[PDB]
Ligand binder design. Structure first.
Ligand SMILES: CCn1c(-c2cc(N3CCN(C)CC3)cnc2[C@H](C)OC)c2c3cc(ccc31)-c1csc(n1)C[C@H](NC(=O)[C@H]1C[C@@H]1C)C(=O)N1CCC[C@H](N1)C(=O)OCC(C)(C)C2
Ligand SMILES: Nc1nc2c(ncn2[C@@H]2O[C@H](COP(=O)(O)OP(=O)(O)NP(=O)(O)O)[C@@H](O)[C@H]2O)c(=O)[nH]1
Ligand SMILES: [Mg+2]
Lengths: 170, 163
C-alpha cells in the first residue's frame, strides 16, 4: 500500500504550527488562540506523481515542557521547523529545536525543512536572506508560508516528504 | 468569610452531580470575585451552560470558555483579561482551583480543577480556591477525558451560583 510518512511540526509557541496543519488537512484558517497539547492527523496526497499518506504530529510550543520532546523526536521521520517571520525570538528558538532533534536521533542527517510562517504580515523582522542563510548552513530547504493565505502550505509539507525520500534511499 | 459557589455538572445533558468550591477571597480577593460573579451570572454573562473542554486524566479538568465554547475564549468581569493577582497559593494536590492563562497577566474566565499535584504550575497560574464538596464528581469527570484532553462526551455546567 502507499508509503506513510511520519511528519512532526515543531517550533516556538504561536508561530502557526496548528494553523499550517489545519490548512493542509481542512483547507481553512481561523485567527483564534488555541494552544496545542498534542494533535495527530492523517491525509493522503500525491507528491511528484507518487501517492502517499501523511501522518502529521502537531506538537506543543509551550516552552515549559521542553524536556517532554525526546520520544516524539525519536518516533518522527521528518521535522517541519517553524518560526514566524515577525517574531525574532521564534527564529532564535529554531536552533535549539534542531540541536535537540539531532541529539535525540544521534545523527547529522535528519530530514527537516525550515519554514518561515506568517509571510502575509507586514511587520517582518526576519529577512528572507537571514533564514535562507540558516537553512543553507543546516543543509535543508527553506520555504516561506502563510497559513492565512495558504501560500506555500502544500509546498512545505511536500518538500519535507521529498527530504525523507532522499534519506530513505541513502 | 470566604464565599462558596457551586457547579451542577451534566454529561450529555444527564445530571452527574454538584461540586462546590471555597473561594480564597482572603488571599486573592480580585480573582475570587471574578469567579464568584461569573458563577452567579450577575454581570449578564458567565459559566452557566458552558463546558469542560479539556480533561486530562491524572492532571486536571479545565473549562470556563463561555464566549466561544471551544477553549479559545472567555472573559473576566474586569475586561477581556486581568493581571496575576499573586502567587501566594500553590498547586498542592487534587481539588485545587486555579486560573488558566496565555502567559503573564492574561487571566480571563478559564480555570482548571486539579486532580493531582501540579507543582510546576506554581508561580505561573493563580490559585484562588479549592473543591469543598463533591470531589467525587470531579473524579467521575476524568473518564470522559483523554491524553490530549479531548472529551468523549459533553461535560457541562448545567447550573451554577453562590451558596
Ligand atoms: C508536553 C505535553 N503536555 C503536558 C504534559 C506534561 C506532563 N508532565 C509534566 C510534569 N512532569 C513532572 C510530569 C510529566 C505529562 N503529560 C503531559 C501531557 C498529558 O502529555 C500529552 C502538559 C501540557 C500543557 C500544554 C501543552 C503540552 C502539555 C499547554 C498548552 S497551553 C497550556 N499548557 C496552558 C493552558 N492555557 C490555555 O489553555 C489557554 C487557552 C486558555 C486561556 C492553561 O492555562 N492550562 C491550565 C493549567 C493546565 C494546562 N492548561 C494543561 O492543559 O496542562 C496539561 C498538563 C497535562 C497538566 C501539562
Ligand atoms: N496572519 C497570520 N496569522 C497566523 C498564521 N499562522 C498562524 N497565525 C495565527 O497565529 C496564532 C498562533 O497560531 P497557532 O497555529 O495556534 O500557533 P501554534 O504554533 O500552533 N501555537 P502552540 O505551539 O501553542 O500550539 C493564531 O492567532 C493564528 O491564527 C499566518 O500564516 N498568518
Ligand atoms: Mg498549536
Amino acid at each position: 500500500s502507499m508509503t506513510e510518512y511520519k511528519l512532526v511540526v515543531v517550533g516556538a509557541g504561536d508561530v502557526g504550527k496548528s494553523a499550517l496543519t489545519i490548512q493542509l488537512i481542512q483547507n481553512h484558517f481561523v485567527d483564534e488562540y488555541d494552544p496545542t497539547i498534542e494533535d495527530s492527523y492523517r491525509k493522503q496526497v500525491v507528491i511528484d506523481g507518487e501517492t502517499c499518506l501523511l501522518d502529521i504530529l502537531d506538537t506543543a510550543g509551550q516552552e515549559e515542557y521542553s524536556a517532554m520532546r525526546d520520544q516524539y523526536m525519536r518516533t518522527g521521520e521528518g521535522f517541519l521547523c517553524v518560526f514566524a517571520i515577525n517574531n525574532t525570538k521564534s527564529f532564535e528558538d529554531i536552533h535549539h529545536y534542531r540541536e535537540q532533534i539531532k541529539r535525540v536521533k544521534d545523527s547529522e542527517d535528519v530530514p527537516m525543512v525550515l519554514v518561515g510562517n506568517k509571510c502575509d504580515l507586514p511587520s517582518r523582522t526576519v529577512d528572507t536572506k537571514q533564514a535562507q542563510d540558516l537553512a543553507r548552513s543546516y543543509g535543508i530547504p527553506f520555504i516561506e508560508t502563510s497559513a492565512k493565505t495558504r501560500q506555500g502550505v502544500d509546498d512545505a509539507f511536500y518538500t519535507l516528504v521529498r527530504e525523507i525520500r532522499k534519506h530513505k534511499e541513502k | 468569610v470566604n464565599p462558596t459557589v457551586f457547579f451542577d455538572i451534566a454529561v450529555d445533558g444527564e445530571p452527574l452531580g454538584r461540586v462546590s468550591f471555597e473561594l480564597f477571597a482572603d488571599k486573592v480577593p480580585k480573582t475570587a470575585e471574578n469567579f464568584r460573579a461569573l458563577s452567579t451570572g450577575e454581570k449578564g454573562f458567565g459559566y452557566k451552560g458552558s463546558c469542560f473542554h479539556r480533561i486530562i486524566p491524572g492532571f486536571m479538568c479545565q473549562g470556563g470558555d463561555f464566549t466561544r465554547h471551544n477553549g479559545t475564549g472567555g472573559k473576566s468581569i474586569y475586561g477581556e483579561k486581568f493581571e496575576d493577582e499573586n502567587f501566594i497559593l500553590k498547586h498542592t494536590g487534587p481539588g485545587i482551583l486555579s486560573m488558566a492563562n496565555a502567559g503573564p497577566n492574561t487571566n480571563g474566565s478559564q480555570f482548571f480543577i486539579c486532580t493531582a499535584k501540579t507543582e510546576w504550575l506554581d508561580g505561573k497560574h493563580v490559585v484562588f480556591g479549592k473543591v469543598k464538596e463533591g470531589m467525587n464528581i470531579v473524579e467521575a469527570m476524568e473518564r470522559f477525558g483523554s491524553r490530549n484532553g479531548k472529551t468523549s462526551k459533553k461535560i457541562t455546567i448545567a447550573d451554577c451560583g453562590q451558596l
